[PDB]
Structure formats: C-alpha cells, structure tokens
Amino acid sequence: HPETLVKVKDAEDQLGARVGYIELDLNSGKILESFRPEERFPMMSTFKVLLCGAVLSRVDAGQEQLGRRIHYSQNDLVEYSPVTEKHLTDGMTVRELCSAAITMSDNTAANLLLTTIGGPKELTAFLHNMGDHVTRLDRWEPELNEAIPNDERDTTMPAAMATTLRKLLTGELLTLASRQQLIDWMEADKVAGPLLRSALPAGWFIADKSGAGERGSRGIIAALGPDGKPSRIVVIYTTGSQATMDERNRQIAEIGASLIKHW
Ligand SMILES: *[B]([O])([O])[C]([C]C1=[C][C]=[C]C(C([O])=O)=C1[O])[N]C([C])=O
C-alpha cells in the first residue's frame, strides 16, 4: 500500500538515513511493495537466520547433528554473548546454539556455528547455490556490524533477503521438519519486542529476526500474517542515521503499524 510508502519516506526524513523496505507475498513471491529494494544494506544479526538455515541443511544431509555438543572456551567469547557465556563449562549443542543465535542474537553462538560450516565463505556459497547471488557474508562477529558506508561486505538487498527467506521457509531446500524448526526459532525471538512485535495485533503470527550495528544500522526480517499463520515477508533495513536506538525502534514500529493498518 502506497500509504505505507508514505511512512517509510517519513522515516527516512525522521532518521536522516536511507530505509530499504520490501513486502513480499509468501505464496506467490510477488512483490507487493518496495522502497530501495535493490540498494545494499548491512545485514547485521539478521544473517543468523541464514546461518541456521545452512546448519539445518547439513543436518538434513547427515553431515551434522542437532544433538552434537560443542565445547568452546572463554577465548571464544565475544561482546554480546548473553547465553554462551553461561555455558562455558558444559558447552552447548548445535540445537541450543541456533536457538541462542536466533532467539537472543548471541554473537559467540554465531561464530561457533560459522566455524562448524566452514566460515563466511561457506555461508556465502550456500546462498549462491540457492539462487542468491547478492547476499554475502565476509567477516565474523562482531566486525561484520561495521557498516562502513559504501562497503559491500556483509550486505544484502531487501529484495534478495526477502526472496531468500521465502525459499528457506517454503522451498524444497529444507525438509519440512527443518523448515519448521527454523520457524520455531524465529517465532521464539526474544529481543525484537519494540519493533514489528509492538504493532502486531492479537492472534497474529510472527516469526522474525532483528539486528543492529554501527552507523545507526538497524533492521528486521519477518514472516507474518493474521490468524496464526504467515502470509507475507517483510524486510526493513536502515543505516547512516545518527539517531538513538529508541528513535530507530519507533520508526520501525511505525512502519509496521502502517503496514498492518493497510493489510
Ligand atoms: B547482530 O546485529 O549482528 C549483533 C548482535 C546483536 C546484539 C544486541 C541486539 C541485537 C538485535 O537487535 O537483534 C543484535 O543483533 N550486533 C552487534 C552490534 O553485535
């Protein structure tokens, strides 16, 4: 809805930064609405969904186990390791790691998982194989959140990320069981409260993943819909603002409010 585009532009004005936006029909893959769909934005922690996706494909293929336990040490600990830092002694399973990386945005959990699949280059190659020739992971946590202007490293495009997420959630790429596992993690998200979630009406379905970074970067990817089921993919990225975290949260939630309102 064009009225949503009005809010998006309003957001750019409010934040004094670029905003990338996309609304995608889950079933058909049709673009319902877009704003700078083909400009690059830093993915930040939104990439964690893609990471667990690659992990799940490995599991499906017998190359990995959800139950496998990983034993890391204090040396692996990076800033923003709310969960990992609590299990230093016993380690954590692949399952718990994906859960932490997604539901809590745990940075260490991501690096550990990155290691198991062969690093950024491997994640990148996974994406490329599934038809996404744009999205790219170049660094590890937490350097990937650098967001230097004009840098292509660790970026995606709103259209690329939307279509990729769609393939992941509804394609033949993952077994049905893995798909669900993926959705289950996004659904249990615990740090995205002040974003789309704040405008969501009761009884609606939401599976999402947020992210933040330097240079006022903030973003969210999500599958949502009325009646406990998703029917649309929404991707929102911003970068360059000198605004506070709170002001960035508000604009995102206001965009959400508009999209819901004009559903
Ligand atoms: B992520 O954006 O790569 C990473 C970890 C992260 C920490 C706190 C809150 C969020 C969010 O809103 O989802 C995160 O993603 N960001 C940094 C700066 O390390």
Instruction: Output the CA 44–ligand 1 centroid distance in Å.
Output: 7
- Has 211 been labeled as part of a binding site? yes
Total number of domains constituting the chain: 1
Which of 46, 80, 103, 220 maximizes ligand 1 atoms within 8 Å of its Cβ, making it the mutation to test the pocket?
Answer: 80
- Output the domain CATH number for residue 95: 3.40.710.10
Quote the CA–CA distance of 248 and 251 in Å, as a whole number.
Answer: 5
Residue 39 appears among annotated catalytic residues: no
Is 44 touching ligand 1 by the criterion CB < 6 Å? yes
Bond preceding residue 142 cis, omega within 30 of 0: yes
- Nearest ligand 1 atom to alpha carbon 144: 3
Is 213 touching ligand 1 by the criterion CB < 6 Å? yes
Q: What was the experiment behind these coordinates?
A: X-ray
Q: 124 lies in which domain range?
A: 1-263
Residue 81 appears among annotated catalytic residues: no
- Nearest ligand 1 atom to alpha carbon 106: 5
